[PDB]
């Protein structure tokens, strides 16, 4: 699907966020082509699972891959590693995955 | 022109940026479809400014054009006119924002 970009309408989507440490659940996360590594909630993850830490506290880094599935798309997206939002509940797709699901940006 | 996404590669762009306070500038912009307002460095204005205080998801890192910003991109002649955009003070950060691609009519295709 096509997009729109507009400074009222976030461009979100339906994703569902694979962390193989709880559950797969789907969430609605962000489009955002200036985000090099994609953000994901704390949320998704157990109360056991060990974090890197790597603002140096809002966000953590993951230990496991996160497998990541579009509404159209079958196969998942796999990500080697991507940030822990451990505060504000964010879910961000970055190139990082905007790459491996051949997303672009058009400009007329 | 198509943008390939890549995480390795910041997505920038060569813009003119006239200010209306100063001499139009070229500058190098990260476009970025997660910014809902473009910012644009404060290296760009005068001495004089008056820049309006603002709040962005920090009190003291951006600042508020009182007069719009005119954008001109490579391909079109037809400049983009921001009724108003962010001011990075800290450092100096080239941002297209959703607002400035909309009047270009750019969007995000995922196939
Ligand atoms: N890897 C990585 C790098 C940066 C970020 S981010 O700063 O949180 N973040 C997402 C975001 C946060 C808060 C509100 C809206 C979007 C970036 C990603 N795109 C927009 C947002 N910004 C651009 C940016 C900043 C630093 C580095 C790279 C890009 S931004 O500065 O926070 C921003 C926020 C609001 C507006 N109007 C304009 C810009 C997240 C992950």
């Given at each position: 699907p096509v997009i729109p970009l507009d400074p009222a309408r976030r461009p979100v989507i339906k994703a569902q966020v694979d962390t193989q440490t709880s559950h797969p659940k789907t969430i609605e996360a962000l489009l955002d082509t200036g985000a090099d590594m994609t953000v994901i909630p704390?949320?998704?993850?157990?109360?056991?699972t060990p974090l890197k830490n790597t603002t140096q506290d809002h966000f953590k880094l993951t230990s496991l891959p996160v497998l990541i599935r579009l509404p159209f798309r079958t196969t998942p997206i796999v990500l080697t590693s991507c940030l822990v939002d451990?505060?504000?509940n964010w879910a961000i797709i970055g190139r990082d995955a905007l790459q491996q699901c051949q997303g672009v940006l058009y400009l007329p």
């Open positions: 704390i949320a998704l993850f157990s109360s056991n451990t505060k504000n």
